[PDB]
Amino acid sequence: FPATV
Amino acid sequence: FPATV
Amino acid sequence: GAMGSMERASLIQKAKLAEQAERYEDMAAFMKGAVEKGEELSCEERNLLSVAYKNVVGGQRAAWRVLSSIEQKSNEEGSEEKGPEVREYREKVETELQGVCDTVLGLLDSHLIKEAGDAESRVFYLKMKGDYYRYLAEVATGDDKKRIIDSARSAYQEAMDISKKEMPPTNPIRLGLALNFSVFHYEIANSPEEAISLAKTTFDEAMADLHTLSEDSYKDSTLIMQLLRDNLTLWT
Amino acid sequence: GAMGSMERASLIQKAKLAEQAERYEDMAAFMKGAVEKGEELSCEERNLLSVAYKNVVGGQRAAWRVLSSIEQKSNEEGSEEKGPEVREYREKVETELQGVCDTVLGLLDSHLIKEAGDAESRVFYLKMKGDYYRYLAEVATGDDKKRIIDSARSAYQEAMDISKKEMPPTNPIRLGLALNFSVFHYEIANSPEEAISLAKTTFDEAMADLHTLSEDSYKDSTLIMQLLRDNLTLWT
Ligand SMILES: C=CC(C)(C)OC[C@H]1O[C@H](O[C@@H]2C3=C([C@H](C)COC(C)=O)C[C@H](O)[C@]3(C)/C=C3/[C@@H](COC)CC[C@H]3[C@@H](C)[C@H]2O)[C@H](O)[C@@H](O)[C@@H]1O
Ligand SMILES: C=CC(C)(C)OC[C@H]1O[C@H](O[C@@H]2C3=C([C@H](C)COC(C)=O)C[C@H](O)[C@]3(C)/C=C3/[C@@H](COC)CC[C@H]3[C@@H](C)[C@H]2O)[C@H](O)[C@@H](O)[C@@H]1O
Ligand SMILES: [Mg+2]
Numbered sequence: 501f502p503a504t505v
Numbered sequence: 506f507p508a509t510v
Numbered sequence: 511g512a513m514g515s516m517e518r519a520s521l522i523q524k525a526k527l528a529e530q531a532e533r534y535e536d537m538a539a540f541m542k543g544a545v546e547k548g549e550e551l552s553c554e555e556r557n558l559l560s561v562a563y564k565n566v567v568g569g570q571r572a573a574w575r576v577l578s579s580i581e582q583k584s585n586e587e588g589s590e591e592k593g594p595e596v597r598e599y600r601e602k603v604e605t606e607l608q609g610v611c612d613t614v615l616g617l618l619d620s621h622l623i624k625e626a627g628d629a630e631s632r633v634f635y636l637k638m639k640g641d642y643y644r645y646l647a648e649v650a651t652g653d654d655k656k657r658i659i660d661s662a663r664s665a666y667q668e669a670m671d672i673s674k675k676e677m678p679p680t681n682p683i684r685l686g687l688a689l690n691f692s693v694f695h696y697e698i699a700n701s702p703e704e705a706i707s708l709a710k711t712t713f714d715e716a717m718a719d720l721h722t723l724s725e726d727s728y729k730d731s732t733l734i735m736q737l738l739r740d741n742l743t744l745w746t
Numbered sequence: 747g748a749m750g751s752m753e754r755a756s757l758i759q760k761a762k763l764a765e766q767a768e769r770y771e772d773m774a775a776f777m778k779g780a781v782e783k784g785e786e787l788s789c790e791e792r793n794l795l796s797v798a799y800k801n802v803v804g805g806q807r808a809a810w811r812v813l814s815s816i817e818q819k820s821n822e823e824g825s826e827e828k829g830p831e832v833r834e835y836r837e838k839v840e841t842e843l844q845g846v847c848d849t850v851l852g853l854l855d856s857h858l859i860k861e862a863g864d865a866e867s868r869v870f871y872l873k874m875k876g877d878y879y880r881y882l883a884e885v886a887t888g889d890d891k892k893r894i895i896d897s898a899r900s901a902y903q904e905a906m907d908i909s910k911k912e913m914p915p916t917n918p919i920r921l922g923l924a925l926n927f928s929v930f931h932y933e934i935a936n937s938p939e940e941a942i943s944l945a946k947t948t949f950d951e952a953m954a955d956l957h958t959l960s961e962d963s964y965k966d967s968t969l970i971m972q973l974l975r976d977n978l979t980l981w982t
C-alpha cells in the first residue's frame with residue numbers, strides 16, 4: 501500500500 | 506521482563 | 511455519552527495516557543467525549559483526535575484486507591467450498607469499520623467543521639472527512655460506492671482549495687492533505703496520472719519553500735515530503 | 747452467549763481467521779463460544795484458546811505496566827499533583843484485565859479441567875489456570891494477594907506433578923509449564939533461587955532427552971529451551 505498520514 | 510510462553 | 515460525567519480536561523489527560531499505553535480505542539473514546547463537550551479543539555487536541563481514530567480504523571483496515579484476501583482466494587477456480595464463514599467474518603469486521611468511520615464523520619459534522627474558521631483547523635477536519643470517506647470507499651461495493659467516492663473527493667477538494675490559499679507549501683497539514691488526496695486518486699478514483707501530478711507538484715513547491723520552514727515542523731514536513739517521494743517511487 | 751447460535755465448527759473456523767488477522771479479542775470470543783458448546787477441545791483447539799487469551803491479556807498487561815509506571819512516578823517526591831486521572835485510568839485497565847482473567851478461569855473451571863483426563867490436556871489447562879492467577883497476582887494489592895498467589899502456585903504444582911509423571915522432559919507443554927512456573931517463583935513469589943533451580947533442572951533434563959524428541963516438536967521445544975536459557979542468563 502502507498503503511504504498516508 | 507523474563508520470558509513466558 | 512458514557513463520557514458525559516467526566517471533565518473535559520480529564521478526558522484530554524486520559525487520551526494522552528491512552529496514547530502512551532497504545533490503547534487507541536480508549537484514546538478515541540476519550541477524544542469523542544472531549545469533542546462532545548461542545549468546545550473547539552486546540553491544535554494539540556486535534557492531533558490526539560486524529561491519531562486515535564487513525565489507529566483504530568488502521569487496525570480494522572489491516573484485518574479487513576487479510577479477510578478479503580482469504581475470501582477472494584476462496585472464490586477462485588479450484589478452491590474448495592468452505593461455507594459462509596469467511597464472508598460472515600469479513601462482513602463483521604467491515605460493519606465495525608463502517609461504524610467507526612460513521613462515528614468520526616458524525617463528530618466532524620456535529621460540530622467540528624461548522625465551527626472551524628482558522629485555516630489550520632478547517633483544513634485538518636476536512637482532510638479527516640476525506641480520509642474517513644476514503645476508508646468507507648475501500649470497502650464499498652453496492653449502489654453507494656460512487657457517492658462515497660464523491661464525498662471523499664469533495665471534502666479533499668475543499669481542504670485543498672483552502673490550503674493553497676491560506677497555508678505555505680511546507681505546512682505539514684497542507685502536505686499531509688496532498689499526500690492522502692494523491693493516494694485517493696491512485697487507489698480509489700482510478701486516476702494514477704492525477705495522483706502522480708499532485709504528488710510531484712506538492713513535493714516540488716515544498717522544496718522551494720524550505721528556506722523558510724520552521725525547525726518545529728521540519729521533521730513532520732520532511733517526513734511527509736519523504737512519503738510523497740516514496741509514493742512517487744512506487745508509482746513510476 | 748452471543749455465540750450460542752453459531753455452529754461449533756464455524757466458531758473454530760472463525761477463530762483461525764481471527765488469528766490470521768491478529769484480531770485476538772474476536773479470536774478469544776469465538777473460542778469461548780466453542781468451549782461453551784460443552785465438548786472437549788482437541789489439541790489444535792486448545793492452542794487456539796490459549797493463544798487468543800494470552801494475546802488479549804498480554805496487551806492489557808503491557809498497558810497496565812505503562813500506566814502503573816506513570817502512577818508511581820506521579821507519587822515520587824517533587825512530582826506535581828495532577829489529580830485522580832492516572833489512578834482512575836490504571837484502575838479501568840486493571841478491572842478490564844481482571845475481567846478477562848476471571849472469564850478464562852471460569853472456562854477452565856466450567857468445565858475444561860474437570861473433563862480433561864489425558865495428561866496433555868490436563869497439564870495444559872492447569873498451566874493456563876496458573877498463568878491467569880499469576881496475571882491476577884501481578885495487579886493484586888489488597889487482602890487478596892496472598893490467596894491469589896497461592897491459587898497460582900497450587901495450579902502450577904498440580905500441573906508439574908502430572909507432567910513429571912506422564913510426559914517426557916522434552917514435551918513442549920511440560921517445558922512451557924516449567925518456564926512459566928519458574929517465572930512465577932522469580933517475579934511473584936519472591937523465590938529467585940527456586941526459579942533458577944527449576945529453570946536449570948528443566949533445561950538439563952530436556953537436553954538429555956533430545957536424542958528422542960520429534961521433528962514436529964523440535965522447534966517448539968528448542969524455542970522453549972532457549973527461553974529457559976534466556977531467563978537463566980537474565981537471572982545469573
Ligand atoms: C497523538 C499525538 C502525538 C503522538 C503527541 O503527536 C503526534 C504527532 O503530532 C504532530 O505531527 C502531526 C502528525 C504526524 C507527523 C507527520 C508525524 O511527524 C513525525 C516526525 O513524527 C502524523 C500524525 O498522524 C499527525 C497528528 C497527523 C497529521 C495529518 C492530520 O490530518 C488530519 C496532517 C499532517 C500531520 C500533522 C498534523 C503533523 O503536524 C507533531 O508535530 C509530531 O511531533 C507528533 O509526533
Ligand atoms: C494459535 C495457534 C497457532 C498460531 C496455529 O499455533 C501456535 C503454535 O502452536 C503450537 O505451539 C505450541 C505453543 C507455542 C510454541 C512454543 C511456539 O513454537 C514455535 C516454534 O512457534 C507458543 C503458543 O503460545 C503455544 C500455543 C502455547 C504453549 C503453552 C500453552 O500453555 C497453556 C505450553 C507450550 C506451548 C505448546 C502448546 C506449543 O506446542 C505449534 O507447535 C506451533 O507451531 C504453533 O506456532
Ligand atoms: Mg466542566
Ligand SMILES: [Mg+2]
Nearest residue numbers: 601604605649
Ligand atoms: Mg457489508
Ligand SMILES: [Mg+2]
Nearest residue numbers: 704707708711
Ligand atoms: Mg492541479
Ligand SMILES: [Mg+2]
Nearest residue numbers: 752753754755
Ligand atoms: Mg451444532
Ligand SMILES: [Mg+2]
Nearest residue numbers: 837840841885
Ligand atoms: Mg483495582
Ligand SMILES: [Mg+2]
Nearest residue numbers: 940943944947
Ligand atoms: Mg524440585
